[PDB]
Amino acid sequence: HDLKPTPGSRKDRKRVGRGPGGTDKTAGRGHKGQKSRSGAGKGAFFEGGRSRLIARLPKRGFNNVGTTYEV
Amino acid sequence: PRAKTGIVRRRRHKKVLKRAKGFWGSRSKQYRNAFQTLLNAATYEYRDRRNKKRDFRRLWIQRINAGARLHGMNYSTFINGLKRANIDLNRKVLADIAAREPEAFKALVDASRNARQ
Amino acid sequence: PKMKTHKMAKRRIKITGTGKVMAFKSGKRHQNTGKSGDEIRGKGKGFVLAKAEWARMKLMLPRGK
Amino acid sequence: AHKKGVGSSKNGRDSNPKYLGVKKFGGEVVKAGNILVRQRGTKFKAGQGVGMGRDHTLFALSDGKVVFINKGKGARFISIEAAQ
Amino acid sequence: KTYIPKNDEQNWVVVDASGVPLGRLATLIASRIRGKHRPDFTPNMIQGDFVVVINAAQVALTGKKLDDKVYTRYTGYQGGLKTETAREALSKHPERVIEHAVFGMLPKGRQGRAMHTRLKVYAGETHPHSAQKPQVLKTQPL
Amino acid sequence: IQTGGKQYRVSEGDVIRVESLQGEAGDKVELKALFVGGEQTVFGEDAGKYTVQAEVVEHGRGKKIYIRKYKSGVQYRRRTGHRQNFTAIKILGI
RNA sequence: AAAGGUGAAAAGAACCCCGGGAGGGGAGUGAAAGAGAACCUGAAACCGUGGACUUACAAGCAGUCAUGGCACCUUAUGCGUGUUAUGGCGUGCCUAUUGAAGCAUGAGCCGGCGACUUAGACCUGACGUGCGAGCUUAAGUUGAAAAACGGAGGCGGAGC
RNA sequence: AACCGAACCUGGAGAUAGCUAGUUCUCCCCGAAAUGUAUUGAGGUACAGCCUCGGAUGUUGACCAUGUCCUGUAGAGCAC
RNA sequence: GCGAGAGCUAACUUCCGUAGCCGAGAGGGAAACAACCCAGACCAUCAGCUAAGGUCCCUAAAUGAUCGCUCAGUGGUUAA
RNA sequence: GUAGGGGAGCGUUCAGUCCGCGGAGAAGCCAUACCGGAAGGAGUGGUGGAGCCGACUGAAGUGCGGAUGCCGGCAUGAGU
Ligand SMILES: [Mg+2]
Ligand SMILES: [Mg+2]
Ligand SMILES: [Mg+2]
Ligand SMILES: [Mg+2]
Ligand SMILES: [Mg+2]
Ligand SMILES: [Mg+2]
Ligand SMILES: [Mg+2]
Ligand SMILES: [Mg+2]
Ligand SMILES: [Mg+2]
Ligand SMILES: [Mg+2]
Ligand SMILES: [Mg+2]
Ligand SMILES: [Mg+2]
Ligand SMILES: [Mg+2]
Ligand SMILES: [Mg+2]
Ligand SMILES: [Mg+2]
Ligand SMILES: [Mg+2]
Ligand SMILES: [Mg+2]
Ligand SMILES: [Mg+2]
Ligand SMILES: [Mg+2]
Ligand SMILES: [Mg+2]
Ligand SMILES: [Mg+2]
Ligand SMILES: [Mg+2]
Ligand SMILES: [Mg+2]
Ligand SMILES: [Mg+2]
Ligand SMILES: [Mg+2]
Ligand SMILES: [Mg+2]
Ligand SMILES: [Mg+2]
Ligand SMILES: [Mg+2]
Ligand SMILES: [Mg+2]
Ligand SMILES: [Mg+2]
Ligand SMILES: [Mg+2]
Ligand SMILES: [Mg+2]
Ligand SMILES: [Mg+2]
Ligand SMILES: [Mg+2]
Ligand SMILES: [Mg+2]
Ligand SMILES: [Mg+2]
Ligand SMILES: [Mg+2]
Ligand SMILES: [Mg+2]
Ligand SMILES: [Mg+2]
Ligand SMILES: [Mg+2]
Ligand SMILES: [Mg+2]
């Protein structure tokens, strides 16, 4: 029981909500919007609904594993 | 493990409620309306600390003007009179002289109208 | 769940030694008789993305390749 | 009672901005190939050390320090004179 | 720590409104009533002096103020706006002109209404208050 | 007859708390008069010449006070403690 | 669907009083009936009895400040506690909004239940720790009021 | 089988919900934005712009003066 | 507010430029009053000076001074 | 000082360890003018009748006024 962990080893987590301390009402999330909502999804490579950068870029060459030499 | 509310909510509540005695009707018996009344009370407390400092100055000034005019002097002329003769009195104090001690206030009057001449 | 690799980004993006991200310049498939010959030359090529676009690509292929 | 239109505009239109004018001003250091004026015409004529693309763009040829020559209106020249 | 006194006095004084401009007399009276002029002055108590008014009927009014100065009452029923000119008010019931001005110049809550009391208007030369032996106060700017 | 920014009224043999003064239990503090609490009266320079004498009686922490601030429809609540330190002072000036 | 609790032990209250009864007051038992079978504690809303100070000329988001009156004295004779009279001052809360006392939303009241989490041996930073040009095991095996083994694998090591 | 432009029961099922509500303990520090372009996009989202924390630099920023170059508005003018 | 378009040189109008404020700003003033004028609130005080704005009574502070003006309640809302 | 970022903490259950209380009476409940910068924390007294505080450490079903939220009790309308 004598022992204690290192200062800065363990930060206590974020408990969002829990009063005007504190992150009041909206728990970081901001006001309204798709970002506000609670669902699993967007995800990460979704820009606008637009037409994605990666989709606009030219593909080059096939793919081959070949042999790799250990240096 | 689970952790019910047990005991905390009622303690908070009683705290508010016990701040709130003497409040009219539900304002002193229902938690929410207590807590609420109390927010507005907050405003009123802070404000009125500053404001009572505003109010008492006023009072002193009233009394001073009165005494001033008993002996045929306006207040403003009485106060430049005092600053001229470099008498340096609080108006709290000036009021109390004016109200409590007649002859003395009189003396300050004569000194001030002299400083005016 | 192991984060998957964004297969679109396979043939169009490159990781670098330092840790920047590359791709090939664009407009080279029927915008030709334009031309100009120095454009056509300058386009078939390759190049580094401006910057804002780096994080996403990095997240596209976790293995770098 | 109410109305039903019908008119419109034939207008609206304009063209995306053409960021023109001088980019390099009087008394400014200059790397080789730094651009100094974007212009529609011969507004600013090349002097010594400055060449001129087809855009009538003036770009400096050999480093140095920028100098403006206004030869009495409508005939003006920009040049580079190196320091020392 | 600042002085709060005790209402001991009941001070009574007689003002003659004869030949005096109405508003000004109204100020002298109103003020003597409210308390200011009293070095001790304390607001949440009424410390004013009792004020008898005489000769209200001879009050001065800066021309052409009679025929033009209008007082307005309202009754609650439609078409209730009843109006009467200074001259009219002054012949019918002068005391109510003085009362009306002075009452305008007191506060309007509980305490002020309570202050109306210590006003006692009479028109003409005499009053019934000689038992209070009130002390006379001159109309002056001072 | 003044300290921490503010005049006070003294006569003789009276305790008075003022803001915290340097010193300790039994210390002595002299003060320049502003006005003579008595006969013929004196004020101004004549008063400053006369002097006042007073023993530091005690150090104290003033009555507690909470500090509440509030602003509507902002979720702005502020609760804070407060205590105002003073020094109690018996008087026996000339 | 809701539902739980006399007492250590039924010793579950013989008998007397009012009442048709219900209910209660005694007595007796019990350590305690301040545990009596509508039986552990028994908060709040909400309903009443009694007492203090108060209110029948009064315009009010009900507070807040200041003072006076009465009352009271177990963190209490002062920085008081309760209560009040009068003056000054004062547009409920939340949400949503360019803008809320708004005649915009929600809400009878109080009590309880009630909302940013878990997972992977994933990704990427901050902090910390152990080893350090190296670092680490997974399944599993054995042991197991503990842990040890286990190098398969994975990460660095060179880029283009 | 007391509400049928497709009955009712259970299940998929915590369907989806760029929408509306709601989001609970305290103090201290800094502190925005409602602009740009792009979007089957217009009350949504991507990237900039603006906020904060940390690590780097080390006066590079700020204002104001001096110097120098750029300008076609105010006015005015009628040379087209 | 200033600079323009649109609009009827209308709108508590619409769309841009620009400064400031509100937004997210309490305090004094403008009766009341996001925006205007003064002014950016760490806490305590029954202390002193000022800003805009004010000093007959409600209401803190000159029923101030001197030279004039208006007599119409103009003051206390419009024009040919 | 709003969204938001950052910092130091208060309180709740359970867990390990230490301290240690408790029928000469625990937790819970009730009153209160004391304490702390705030979450909050003690002193005394009344209740109750068998369990529990403090400290350090660990893990959470961990803190409510809102959701026409859910269950429950009791008000208003009304002696209508
Ligand atoms: Mg935080
Ligand atoms: Mg809320
Ligand atoms: Mg919301
Ligand atoms: Mg002040
Ligand atoms: Mg408000
Ligand atoms: Mg707001
Ligand atoms: Mg029976
Ligand atoms: Mg009663
Ligand atoms: Mg009356
Ligand atoms: Mg009465
Ligand atoms: Mg709206
Ligand atoms: Mg907003
Ligand atoms: Mg309403
Ligand atoms: Mg409403
Ligand atoms: Mg709505
Ligand atoms: Mg309703
Ligand atoms: Mg590290
Ligand atoms: Mg049918
Ligand atoms: Mg659902
Ligand atoms: Mg499904
Ligand atoms: Mg700041
Ligand atoms: Mg929005
Ligand atoms: Mg961004
Ligand atoms: Mg510089
Ligand atoms: Mg012009
Ligand atoms: Mg508009
Ligand atoms: Mg403001
Ligand atoms: Mg204001
Ligand atoms: Mg006002
Ligand atoms: Mg407005
Ligand atoms: Mg001035
Ligand atoms: Mg006055
Ligand atoms: Mg702050
Ligand atoms: Mg424990
Ligand atoms: Mg327990
Ligand atoms: Mg509720
Ligand atoms: Mg309803
Ligand atoms: Mg219900
Ligand atoms: Mg009846
Ligand atoms: Mg009825
Ligand atoms: Mg009936």
UniProtKB/Swiss-Prot annotation, chain B:
Keywords carried by this UniProt record: Ribonucleoprotein, Ribosomal protein, RNA-binding, rRNA-binding
Gene Ontology annotations for the cellular component aspect, listed alphabetically: cytosolic large ribosomal subunit
GO molecular function: rRNA binding; structural constituent of ribosome
Pfam family for this entry, one: Ribosomal_L20
GO BP: ribosomal large subunit assembly; translation
Database matches in Gene3D superfamilies: 6.10.160.10, Ribosomal protein L20
Function noted in UniProt: Binds directly to 23S rRNA, probably serving to organize its structure.
Similarity comment text for this entry: Belongs to the bacterial ribosomal protein bL20 family.
Subunit structure: Part of the 50S ribosomal subunit. Contacts proteins L13 and L21.
Protein name: Large ribosomal subunit protein bL20
Source organism of the structure: Deinococcus radiodurans (strain ATCC 13939 / DSM 20539 / JCM 16871 / CCUG 27074 / LMG 4051 / NBRC 15346 / NCIMB 9279 / VKM B-1422 / R1)
Curated annotation (Swiss-Prot), chain C:
Disulphide bonds in the chain: none
A Gene Ontology term for the protein's cellular component: cytosolic large ribosomal subunit
Keywords for the protein's UniProt record, in alphabetical order: Ribonucleoprotein, Ribosomal protein, RNA-binding, rRNA-binding
GO molecular function: rRNA binding; structural constituent of ribosome
Keyword rRNA-binding set for record: yes
Stretches of the chain forming a coiled coil according to its record: none
Protein's GO biological process: translation
Domain of life according to the entry: Bacteria
One Pfam family from the record: Ribosomal_L35p
HAMAP family referenced in this protein's UniProt entry, alphabetically: Ribosomal_bL35 (MF_00514)
Subunit structure: Part of the 50S ribosomal subunit. Contacts proteins L15 and L33.
Family the entry assigns: Belongs to the bacterial ribosomal protein bL35 family.
Function as written in the Swiss-Prot or TrEMBL entry: Binds the 23S rRNA.
Descriptive protein name: Large ribosomal subunit protein bL35
UniProtKB/Swiss-Prot annotation, chain E:
Location of the region described as Disordered in the Swiss-Prot/TrEMBL record: 124-142
UniProt feature coiled coil, ranges: none
Any single Gene Ontology cellular-component annotation: ribosome
Superkingdom of origin organism: Bacteria
A GO molecular-function descriptor: structural constituent of ribosome
GO biological process: negative regulation of translation; translation
Keyword line: Ribonucleoprotein, Ribosomal protein, RNA-binding, rRNA-binding
Role description: This protein is one of the early assembly proteins of the 50S ribosomal subunit. Binds to the 23S rRNA.
Subunit text: Part of the 50S ribosomal subunit. Contacts proteins L3 and L20.
Family (UniProt): Belongs to the universal ribosomal protein uL13 family.
Protein name: Large ribosomal subunit protein uL13
Included stretch of the parent chain: 30 to 171 of 174
UniProtKB/Swiss-Prot annotation, chain F:
Disulphide-bridged cysteine pairs: none
Keyword terms: Ribonucleoprotein, Ribosomal protein, RNA-binding, rRNA-binding
Pfam families, per database record: Ribosomal_L21p
Annotated GO MF terms: rRNA binding; structural constituent of ribosome
Coiled coil: none
Cellular compartments per GO CC: cytoplasm; ribonucleoprotein complex; ribosome
Lipid metabolism listed as a keyword: no
Superkingdom assignment: Bacteria
SUPFAM superfamilies according to UniProt: L21p-like
Listed InterPro entries: bL21-like (IPR028909), bL21-like_sf (IPR036164), Ribosomal_bL21 (IPR001787)
UniProt record, GO biological process: translation
Similarity annotation: Belongs to the bacterial ribosomal protein bL21 family.
Biological function: Binds directly to 23S rRNA, probably serving to organize its structure.
PANTHER family: 50S RIBOSOMAL PROTEIN L21, LARGE RIBOSOMAL SUBUNIT PROTEIN BL21M
Quaternary structure and interacting proteins, as annotated: Part of the 50S ribosomal subunit. Contacts proteins L15 and L20.
Protein name: Large ribosomal subunit protein bL21
Source organism per UniProt: Deinococcus radiodurans (strain ATCC 13939 / DSM 20539 / JCM 16871 / CCUG 27074 / LMG 4051 / NBRC 15346 / NCIMB 9279 / VKM B-1422 / R1)
